[PDB]
Amino acid sequence: MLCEIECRALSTAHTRLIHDFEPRDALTYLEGKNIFTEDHSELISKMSTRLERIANFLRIYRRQASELGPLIDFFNYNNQSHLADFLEDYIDFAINEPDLLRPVVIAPQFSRQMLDRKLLLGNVPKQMTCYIREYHVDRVIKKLDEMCDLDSFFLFLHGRAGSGKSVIASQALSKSDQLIGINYDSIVWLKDSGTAPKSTFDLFTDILLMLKSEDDLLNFPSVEHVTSVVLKRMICNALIDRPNTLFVFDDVVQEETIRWAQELRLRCLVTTRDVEISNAASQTCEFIEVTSLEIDECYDFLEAYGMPMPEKEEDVLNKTIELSSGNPATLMMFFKSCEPKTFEKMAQLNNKLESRGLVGVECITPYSYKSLAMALQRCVEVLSDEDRSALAFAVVMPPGVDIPVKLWSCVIPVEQLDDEVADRLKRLSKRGALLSGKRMPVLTFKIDHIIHMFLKHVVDAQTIANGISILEQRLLEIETVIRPEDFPKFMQLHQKFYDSL
Amino acid sequence: QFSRQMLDRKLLLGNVPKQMTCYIREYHVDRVIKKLDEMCDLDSFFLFLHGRAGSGKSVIASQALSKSDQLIGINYDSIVWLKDSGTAPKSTFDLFTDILLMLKSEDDLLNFPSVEHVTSVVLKRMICNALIDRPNTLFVFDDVVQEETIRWAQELRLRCLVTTRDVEISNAASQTCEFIEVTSLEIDECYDFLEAYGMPMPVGEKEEDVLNKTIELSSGNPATLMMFFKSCEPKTFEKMAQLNNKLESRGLVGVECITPYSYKSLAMALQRCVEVLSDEDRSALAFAVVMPPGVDIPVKLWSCVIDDEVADRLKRLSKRGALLSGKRMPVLTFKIDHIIHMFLKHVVDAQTIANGISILEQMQLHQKFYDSL
Amino acid sequence: DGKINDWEEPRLDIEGFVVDYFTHRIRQNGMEWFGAPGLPSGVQPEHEMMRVMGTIFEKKHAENFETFSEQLLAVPRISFSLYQDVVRTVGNAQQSPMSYGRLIGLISFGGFVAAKMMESVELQGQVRNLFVYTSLFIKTRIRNNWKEHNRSWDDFMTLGKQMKEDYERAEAE
Numbered sequence A: 001m002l003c004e005i006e007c008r009a010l011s012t013a014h015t016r017l018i019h020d021f022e023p024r025d026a027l028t029y030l031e032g033k034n035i036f037t038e039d040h041s042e043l044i045s046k047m048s049t050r051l052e053r054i055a056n057f058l059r060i061y062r063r064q065a066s067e068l069g070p071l072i073d074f075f076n077y078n079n080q081s082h083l084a085d086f087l088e089d090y091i092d093f094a095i096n097e098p099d100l101l102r103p104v105v106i107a108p109q110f111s112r113q114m115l116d117r118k119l120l121l122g123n124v125p126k127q128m129t130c131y132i133r134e135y136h137v138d139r140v141i142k143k144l145d146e147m148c149d150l151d152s153f154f155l156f157l158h159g160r161a162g163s164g165k166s167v168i169a170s171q172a173l174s175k176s177d178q179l180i181g182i183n184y185d186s187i188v189w190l191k192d193s194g195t196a197p198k199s200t201f202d203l204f205t206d207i208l209l210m211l212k213s214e215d216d217l218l219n220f221p222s223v224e225h226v227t228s229v230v231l232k233r234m235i236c237n238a239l240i241d242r243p244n245t246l247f248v249f250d251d252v253v254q255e256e257t258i259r260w261a262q263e264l265r266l267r268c269l270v271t272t273r274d275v276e277i278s279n280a281a282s283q284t285c286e287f288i289e290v291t292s293l294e295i296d297e298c299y300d301f302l303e304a305y306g307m308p309m310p311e312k313e314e315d316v317l318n319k320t321i322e323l324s325s326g327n328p329a330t331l332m333m334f335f336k337s338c339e340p341k342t343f344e345k346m347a348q349l350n351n352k353l354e355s356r357g358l359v360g361v362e363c364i365t366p367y368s369y370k371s372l373a374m375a376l377q378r379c380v381e382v383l384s385d386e387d388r389s390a391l392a393f394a395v396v397m398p399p400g401v402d403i404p405v406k407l408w409s410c411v412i413p414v415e416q417l418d419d420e421v422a423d424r425l426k427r428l429s430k431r432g433a434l435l436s437g438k439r440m441p442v443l444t445f446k447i448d449h450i451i452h453m454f455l456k457h458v459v460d461a462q463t464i465a466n467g468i469s470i471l472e473q474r475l476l477e478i479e480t481v482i483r484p485e486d487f488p489k490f491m492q493l494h495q496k497f498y499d500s501l
Numbered sequence B: 001q002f003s004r005q006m007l008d009r010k011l012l013l014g015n016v017p018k019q020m021t022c023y024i025r026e027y028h029v030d031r032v033i034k035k036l037d038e039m040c041d042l043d044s045f046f047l048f049l050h051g052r053a054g055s056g057k058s059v060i061a062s063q064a065l066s067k068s069d070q071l072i073g074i075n076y077d078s079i080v081w082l083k084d085s086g087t088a089p090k091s092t093f094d095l096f097t098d099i100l101l102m103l104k105s106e107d108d109l110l111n112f113p114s115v116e117h118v119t120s121v122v123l124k125r126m127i128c129n130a131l132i133d134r135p136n137t138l139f140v141f142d143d144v145v146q147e148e149t150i151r152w153a154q155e156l157r158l159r160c161l162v163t164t165r166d167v168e169i170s171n172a173a174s175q176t177c178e179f180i181e182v183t184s185l186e187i188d189e190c191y192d193f194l195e196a197y198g199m200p201m202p203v204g205e206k207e208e209d210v211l212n213k214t215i216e217l218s219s220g221n222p223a224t225l226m227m228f229f230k231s232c233e234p235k236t237f238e239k240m241a242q243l244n245n246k247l248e249s250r251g252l253v254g255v256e257c258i259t260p261y262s263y264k265s266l267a268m269a270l271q272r273c274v275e276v277l278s279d280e281d282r283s284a285l286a287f288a289v290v291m292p293p294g295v296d297i298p299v300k301l302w303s304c305v306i307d308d309e310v311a312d313r314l315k316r317l318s319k320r321g322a323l324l325s326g327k328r329m330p331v332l333t334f335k336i337d338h339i340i341h342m343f344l345k346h347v348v349d350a351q352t353i354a355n356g357i358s359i360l361e362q363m364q365l366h367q368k369f370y371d372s373l
Numbered sequence C: 001d002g003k004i005n006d007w008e009e010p011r012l013d014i015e016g017f018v019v020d021y022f023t024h025r026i027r028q029n030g031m032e033w034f035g036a037p038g039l040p041s042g043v044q045p046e047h048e049m050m051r052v053m054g055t056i057f058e059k060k061h062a063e064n065f066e067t068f069s070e071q072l073l074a075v076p077r078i079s080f081s082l083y084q085d086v087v088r089t090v091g092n093a094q095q096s097p098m099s100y101g102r103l104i105g106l107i108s109f110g111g112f113v114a115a116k117m118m119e120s121v122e123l124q125g126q127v128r129n130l131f132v133y134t135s136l137f138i139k140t141r142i143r144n145n146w147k148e149h150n151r152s153w154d155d156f157m158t159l160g161k162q163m164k165e166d167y168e169r170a171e172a173e
């Protein structure tokens, strides 16, 4: 049995083998060195095509051979030293001059054509070319490049629903010309979105089908009554033929997927909303959060996708940006909704959002859900009993404020004290990016506009009242900066907001 | 790095979990390796890695097989690792169906990924036949609960490494039996452990008092410590102190959370440990709550709360789950760890404590404690 | 016995034929499968013919297209075994495992289901899986057959051209 490196070599040699390798030339010889049995030979010789034979030949060789020597020797024995040297070189570089292997041996042989093929066969979604959040796309690329030589790993691209994780993941893989081909030998992109108990299992049944996409699948087994161990063993077996595969698990919700990926020792790029699932790992974990688009980033977005570019006209735009809350998913739900190109009809929308929720700006963009709301519903349904409640009472709070704990400790339901409100608030920001916070000068939390617009039309308004006037009882018992302890005396600073209910 | 890759592919095919490297309790790991090495040539044996739920058995087991190709390579040809956790009657059959499947070839498996409906007796005949085409194989039965697993193992003459919370399951093995106890972590270890994972590391009594308070409240439980570790963000002693008081107030549920471990808290873990005790012990222990934790208590004292039908019915709890610990020489005394107490204190129905209380005042060396209840 | 055939050429990967027809049929419904992978060299001549045949086919053989689509969509998640169960009848009945007829039928039926799936974000994200299942189900059958039964894309192309005309010839009679 070969190791991954010895298999990468064969893989890298493919281009050469397809040109002048005829598996039959090697049968008598390998039978002689006791590597192939007469059966392996017929399983190989019988195929109707040379590529078919090469494919059968390589599966048996990876299983039976214990090193490339016999194959290297064979090629010199058949006067095809050009193939035997390539395999011998690859290995000598791999062992004695790594990090030179890719530059010298691997990279030389690889074209954009081959790269775009790997992507198709990998099921990678077509790369968006309009707006390209360069910073993030290159962070992914840089990290996938420095991690590429770890046996297995987890690169987490986490962020709020719609932040643009998926789009980024695709761009990083489609944009680079090194990653898929040089850094990694191939890729497998699969969308999870599992929520049921058998979701992870179904996920990995596909991975199995994926890794055996070029095997005989005439009698591929129904897996309805197969156990998890068996599914795994089968995936491990199939992995030998697929060295250095990058697995992209799109939209992971259940920590089970992380667990399986780890047991299978895969190299992974995971896109998720709940970074806490990474806690299931014991493997090397790296992260990159897809944060909300900055103020000027929303502009770049609005620019390339049509929208004009600005006194009182600018204000109107700044309002979209405030309501969009830097969420690319929501920002896009605007463009497709603003028939005109006038900041007017644009304003129409903005207002409608201020009048109905987000359901107003309902749409049919390339995103999965109709309204970012439905997309947030799921995040909410995966929260703890307590958190889902704490998150509910955050309704009664101004969007875009750096309000400190004691102030939150009012509306959020619960020796020690209310450090726990901080804990619940720290979780709603970790598991869904529903809220956020800053370490200093003094620890605080914030609730963005879109997530406030969401929270509004989701709780029997009889809960807002009960709370808004339960703060109206905590204010009496006691600007771009944080209100000092002497300020949590009043809530009138934000009255245009605390009263417009 | 080929011999490394080979060792690692053999491990990946054996369902061996990827070993944890950040922290390695070298003593126990080397111990398992050494013994497995000196037993490799028998016909069938039973190395028993036993310890409290989450003391680090499973983790050590993989580290043992993952260090070098000494075991999986020289001493043994291949390995098969399966997590049992069996609790029902057909469980053993189900566990060995997986064994059978783990033994066939790749094409075999593909064409028949499930076992036909056969009798447990027939299955064993099949396992037995499949076992000749696979010599010198080390089997690892992770989390064995029922003795039947061990007995079927003997019936098949398998060389096994077994991880279990209950040492008694070995009273089914007739041949070779070696043991290795996975004890709680000494203060030293907990420090190396917490350190390895970038935990603070004290400067001064005040900070040390905090770390030791945490070290104490977990009785050196790797699983609970790790839960503490990942629950400690900021990652400062002020936060540590915060967690510490959350435990002493709410119980093991205070640091409940996702970790490599399959249970969110030792609570759920121990819950099943209890469930597998003679109703007599499931209540013999479910009383020891109203007692001072960490303190050595001699039978005579214990008698007053649970003698010989109390000097051993309590000795069991120490062998079946490690919920208590026996200590003889000088006096035969049994102590309950703080972690265990924290467990009972919040499970033993709110009232069975108040009644065990009264019938106990027949003590104040532990004033702050007894009062607490 | 030999050396690199039509169907073995990168530009003719069966996945290209499938992603394409799927993207196509879906557009013929106003919808647009934004999740579709990208074609390494854009739409190919052989891809266009597939659309034609795939179109001719859905018409004259739409028989069980809605019955089968029903069976496929009657589950929270579509699978490969289920998919194989449903489609082991599309294109052939009671034969080479992959005749031009079966190929067309499978891709035609696949694109059809792809559209229905799109008309519902719940059953949407699965178009990706249907793409895989359709690609693999054909792939393993063109494998050890097309060479010995004398099939190829060029041949298909020759046959597609005639069928295309003979069909438009009748559309005006």
Ligand SMILES: Nc1ncnc2c1ncn2[C@@H]1O[C@H](COP(=O)(O)OP(=O)(O)OP(=O)(O)O)[C@@H](O)[C@H]1O
Pocket (backbone or CB within 6 Å): A128, A130, A131, A132, A133, A159, A160, A161, A162, A163, A164, A165, A166, A167, A168, A251, A271, A272, A273, A328, A329, A330, A332, A333, A365, A366, A367, A368, A375
């Ligand atoms: N660069 C971009 N160009 C166009 N639309 C974009 C871009 N980045 C994000 N979007 C918008 O956000 C969604 C696309 O990206 P993406 O699906 O990554 O968000 P997401 O974080 O993956 O969603 P979820 O978190 O629910 O998986 C769609 O609304 C899409 O239009």
Ligand SMILES: Nc1ncnc2c1ncn2[C@@H]1O[C@H](COP(=O)(O)OP(=O)(O)OP(=O)(O)O)[C@@H](O)[C@H]1O
Pocket (backbone or CB within 6 Å): B020, B021, B022, B023, B024, B025, B051, B052, B053, B054, B055, B056, B057, B058, B059, B060, B143, B163, B164, B165, B222, B223, B224, B226, B227, B259, B260, B261, B269
């Ligand atoms: N280096 C380490 N050594 C031991 N445990 C560790 C280490 N790093 C983290 N842990 C934590 O230890 C616990 C897992 O240990 P392990 O699986 O042996 O326990 P166990 O004795 O098998 O429990 P059970 O008896 O319930 O199976 C988890 O909380 C895991 O995160």
Ligand SMILES: [Mg+2]
Pocket (backbone or CB within 6 Å): A165, A166, A167, A250, A251, A271
């Ligand atoms: Mg996404």
Ligand SMILES: [Mg+2]
Pocket (backbone or CB within 6 Å): B057, B058, B142, B143, B163
């Ligand atoms: Mg275990």
